[PDB]
Design a protein around this ligand. Structure first.
Ligand SMILES: [Zn+2]
Ligand SMILES: [Zn+2]
Lengths: 221, 197, 90, 33, 97, 135, 97
RNA sequence: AUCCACUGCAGCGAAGGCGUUCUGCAAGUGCACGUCCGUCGAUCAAGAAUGAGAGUUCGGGGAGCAAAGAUGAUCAGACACCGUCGUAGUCCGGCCACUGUAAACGAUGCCGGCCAGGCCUUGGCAGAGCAAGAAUCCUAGACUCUGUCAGGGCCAACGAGAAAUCCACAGCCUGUGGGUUCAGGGGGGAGUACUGUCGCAAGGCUGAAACUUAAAGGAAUUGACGGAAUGGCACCA
RNA sequence: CACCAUGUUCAA
């Protein structure tokens, strides 16, 4: 009875992700003065990277895309956040290691404000006999300073699109676990979560043809 | 008044002159201080600047309620407001008032940075009736205060009776005429306040 | 010799007004009457002129703050928060 | 169980009864003096 | 009649240990006295794994996600829900599973 | 009615499965979660207060929600399982495997599977005092 | 920032010449006796500026002490205050070195 | 408000106690050493400073939980457990608020000497190693081995013990003496009364007697019992 | 994990 007054809209993802046509979302249709475009404007979707890129090697990453503009039956989603999966990071955390966490609030030079929480774990050397592989507190402070400046040098001086592209191509994690071996070897260094705090003015044409390139897929209806 | 005042001298806008304005003093303000008033003023104690140049944690006093108005909010001893948030869509701003309320005022209203001086004066118990005598003798003719149960029914809706008491509920309505509007005016609740207010 | 045990400056009130009120007014009046430290000249010279007005007898400074004590506690924290807010939005 | 044989009721509760008794006594002697 | 050399708890060189809350009872028990078990299960048991993997797209056997719980118990609820059982005086000194 | 797409496609909704010890929600919504499509609880399918958490009630509830989401046009479900969480219990209740099986056997394709039990970085005081629910 | 100024000042007061006080400092600056001028942080801005101007005229160095007049006196070994300090003969103090 | 998982036969602190990140402030232990002093030390009635939680005081805060209270069940009763609310309280600040108690426990005073073996672990210092990202270079706070100092434990002789058990001590004790402080003298009455002193109070510290009684008590054993566990069993189930 | 209270005195 309630489906009679609803339309479906295609949810189109940005240029970074291979698959664009996803998430036929619902909304109540228009009755004149009130339309459904401002009902869809902000409709955050949590979508797995394993489905945005069709490769299962990345299927442990949820990406939250925020709707910003609609065209016909195509609503344009931009990056809003990203995170691991609970399964993933709870499997990552095991006991006798030491977890190093880092959190930064940085600017992508687009005006976007990003929170980046990265998680890493100390590593057992192959010849190790002890059970601890615990890091010391000074060692962890040094590792966290390295983490901070790596995450900075990575995201700032790089637009949000390239930032998302790195988050996909998780180069920050590998750079950190590579630089870690001098303080304490780390393992499974991944960005646990990334959020967009403050975003600049909208610029709809910019949203249309820079985070997308056009090419809006065939909005079936 | 409980708060000290400050004669602050500016130059005349268009005349060769010196206009000596008088504003409630900020706590920490001293004589010869060089306070600054305007849009490009800095976030320093005593400065007067629009409610838009203020970050969203600023503690303000002498706050305006309207633009071009002059300091009608947060003016008593130890009074201060806290700038909660700004809205550029409207050019407005949510502020938390000493009463604990949250008022929305335009972001062109000017405040003063800091506390109102003379704070802490209710933290001394008036020990005598003479202290309150001298207190109100310079404010207005309001002290002492005869209670209505002690009057005669000609003088108050509470007077009379062979025992001093109110025979009717004290909580009177809001539409009550002037003359039976004595007691607890349009009270939403009564009794001891416990838990939340 | 020592002239009181618990009563301090509140010996003027004698027996009246209640012990628990004379306690509070003692804590208040000690400070109201004492000379406070001048962070300008470095001398304990601020005398309370009126409510909220403190004049330094050495430096000559005249400051607004505090009914019974030169600096309230909220004043000392407001100075810090305002300082850090200005520091960050330099 | 965790303890061995109180030869009366729980020591905490008879301690509490003693405290109540003691302040009843205190009030009766404050009556007089 | 000291029953345990470590008096029911692993507190040594500490004075105070954080008090955690039993998973089901809700009792405040010291973090070292509590009987704690980090358990890993699956979202699906083999009573349903085939039936779900046959209708899945991105999953199959040896692929379904897991549950990582870390159940902490007081001694009462541990003994009742038979997470632990009373042992002999000589088999109480056994500390490895 | 339903959505229109090419032949070889799947319409994906998200099915939140709230499996507490007293009830069982099966809740099919749009991927946004903002637009509920159909939700059915284990208490809509039984008479007794006990059986609200029975594995049979959850089966019937997930069934009767699957038929309606098919009626609406949803063919696959990203599944989001949940226990009461927070301070109560991070263990999923009985009617969770039965809801999963109900959907899978009924015919909905199953995409991702997830655990969204609310958990605390640190928590408010749990119900029951220091001594807990003495029984 | 290193804090051995308060240590070299002990050496100055042990052996060497100092001038405590605004007028003593101005006299050393008017003559060619001063080698360093330390200034308490709380000094009046006008006297601060006047002494810094005299020092830039005399090509003398100025050091902002990061203490009060109370602390400058205490570092000198004194039970009074001092806003200025002129160091005429370092002695063995090793400040400007 | 609180800092999950990491979080432990881990660390730190005199104890109480201490767990997100960056940061200001002062501090401690240990280690290294041909640094300085030169006995300045040990234990301590009185005195002093910290002292969980509850409690009190003044001003705020109040999410969650929750004495009292309300309230629905259960019950013979059930202002009990169970359930729904709910106030004080729990949170913050204060002349440097007050109090000054806990199964404040290791139920184990402190300083010093000696005390078989094996194992794990924390922090240094010393000497070695096949021992580590990006690469392949190169070094690296990682890892392995050994020694030693300091710390935290585990299990194994002698000894000790009433035994349980202790084991870097609860050993070195009728083969009794290194030094020092505190406390106990059958069970109750009783940690009560009176008095003194501290506190806003609650109360803390101090602290008997009359009278009463032959056991209280500790460890261990054998059986019995258990609405304890495990495993067998019976149509007197 | 509904609810399941009690057993006169000495003697054995
Ligand atoms: Zn002065
Ligand atoms: Zn329990």
């Amino acid at each position: 009875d309630f489906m009679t007054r609803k339309e479906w809209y295609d949810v189109v993802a940005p240029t970074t992700f291979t698959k664009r046509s996803i998430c036929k979302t619902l909304v109540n249709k228009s009755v004149g003065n009130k339309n459904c475009t401002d009902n869809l404007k902000g409709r955050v979707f949590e979508l797995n990277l394993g489905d945005l890129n069709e490769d299962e090697s990345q299927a442990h990453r949820n990406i939250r895309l925020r709707v910003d503009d609609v065209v016909g039956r195509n609503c344009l989603t931009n990056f809003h956040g990203m995170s691991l999966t609970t399964d993933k990071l709870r499997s990552l955390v095991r006991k006798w290691c030491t977890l190093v966490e880092a959190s930064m609030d940085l600017k992508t030079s687009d005006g976007f404000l990003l929170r980046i929480f990265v998680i890493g774990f100390t590593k057992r050397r192959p010849n190790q006999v002890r059970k601890n592989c615990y890091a010391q507190h000074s060692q962890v402070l040094r590792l966290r300073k390295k983490m901070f400046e790596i995450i900075s040098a990575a995201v700032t001086k790089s637009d949000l699109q390239s930032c998302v592209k790195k988050f996909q191509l998780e180069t920050i994690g590998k750079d950190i676990e590579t630089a870690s071996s001098r303080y304490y070897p780390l393992r499974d260094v991944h960005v646990r979560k990334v959020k967009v705090l403050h975003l600049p003015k909208f610029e709809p044409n910019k949203l249309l043809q820079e985070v997308h390139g056009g090419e809006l897929p065939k909005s079936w209806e | 008044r409980g708060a000290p005042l400050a004669k602050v001298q500016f130059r005349h806008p268009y005349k060769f002159k010196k206009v000596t304005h008088l504003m409630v003093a900020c706590e920490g303000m001293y004589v010869g201080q060089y306070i600054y008033c305007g849009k490009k003023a800095q976030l320093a104690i005593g400065n007067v600047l629009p409610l838009s140049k203020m970050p969203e944690g600023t503690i303000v006093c002498n706050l305006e309620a309207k633009v071009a108005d002059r300091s009608r909010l947060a003016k008593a001893s130890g009074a201060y407001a806290i700038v909660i948030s700004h809205n550029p869509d409207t050019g407005k701003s949510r502020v938390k008032l000493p009463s604990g309320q949250k008022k929305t005022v335009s972001s062109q209203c000017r405040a003063m940075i800091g506390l109102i001086a003379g704070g802490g004066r209710i933290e001394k118990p008036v020990l005598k009736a003479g202290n309150n005598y001298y207190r109100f003798k310079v404010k207005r003719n309001c002290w002492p205060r005869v209670r209505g149960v002690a009057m005669s029914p000609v003088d108050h809706p509470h007077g009379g009776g062979n025992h001093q008491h109110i025979g009717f509920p004290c909580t009177v309505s809001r539409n009550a005429p002037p003359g039976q509007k004595v007691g607890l005016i349009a009270a939403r609740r009564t009794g001891r306040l416990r838990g939340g207010v | 010799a020592r002239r009181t045990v618990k009563v301090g400056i509140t010996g003027k009130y004698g027996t009246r007004y209640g012990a628990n009120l004379r306690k509070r007014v003692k804590k208040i009046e000690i400070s109201k009457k004492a000379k406070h430290f001048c962070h300008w000249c470095g001398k304990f010279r601020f005398k309370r002129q009126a409510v909220g007005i403190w004049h330094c007898t050495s430096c000559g400074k005249t400051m607004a703050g505090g009914a019974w004590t030169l600096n309230t506690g909220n004043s000392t924290t407001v100075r810090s928060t305002i300082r850090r807010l200005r520091e960050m939005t330099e | 169980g965790s303890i061995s044989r109180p030869r009366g009721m729980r020591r905490k509760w008879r301690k509490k009864r003693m405290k109540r008794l003691q302040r009843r006594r205190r009030k009766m002697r404050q009556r007089s003096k | 009649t000291v029953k345990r050399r470590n008096h029911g708890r692993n507190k040594k060189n500490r004075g105070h240990v954080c008090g955690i809350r039993c998973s089901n009872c809700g009792r405040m028990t010291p973090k070292d006295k509590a009987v704690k078990r980090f358990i890993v299960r699956n979202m699906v048991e083999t009573a349903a794994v085939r039936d779900i993997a046959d209708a899945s797209v991105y999953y199959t056997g040896y692929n379904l996600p897991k549950l990582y719980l870390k159940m902490q118990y007081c001694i009462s609820c541990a003994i009742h829900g038979r997470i632990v059982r009373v042992r002999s005086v000589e088999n109480r000194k056994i500390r490895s599973p | 009615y339903g959505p229109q797409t090419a032949a070889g496609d799947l319409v994906f909704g998200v099915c939140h499965i709230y499996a507490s010890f007293n009830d069982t929600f099966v809740h099919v919504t749009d991927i946004s979660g903002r637009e509920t499509i159909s939700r059915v609880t284990g208490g809509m399918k039984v008479k007794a207060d006990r059986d609200e958490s029975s594995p049979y009630a959850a089966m019937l509830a997930a069934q009767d929600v699957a038929e309606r989401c098919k009626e609406c046009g949803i063919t696959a479900l990203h599944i989001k399982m949940r226990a009461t969480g927070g301070t109560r219990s991070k263990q999923p209740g009985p009617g969770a495997q039965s809801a999963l099986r109900a959907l899978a056997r009924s015919g909905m394709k199953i995409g991702r599977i997830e655990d969204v039990t609310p958990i605390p970085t640190d928590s408010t005081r749990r119900k029951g005092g220091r001594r807990g629910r003495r029984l | 920032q290193d804090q051995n100024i308060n240590s070299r000042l002990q050496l100055v007061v042990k052996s060497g010449k100092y001038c405590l006080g605004y007028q003593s400092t101005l006299k050393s600056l008017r003559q060619g006796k001063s080698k360093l001028v330390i200034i308490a942080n709380n000094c009046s801005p006008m006297r601060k500026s006047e002494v810094e101007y005299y020092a830039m005229l005399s090509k003398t160095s100025v050091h902002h002490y990061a203490g009060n007049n109370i602390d400058l006196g205490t570092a000198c070994g004194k039970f009074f205050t001092a806003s200025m300090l002129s160091i005429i003969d370092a002695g063995d103090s090793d400040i400007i070195r």
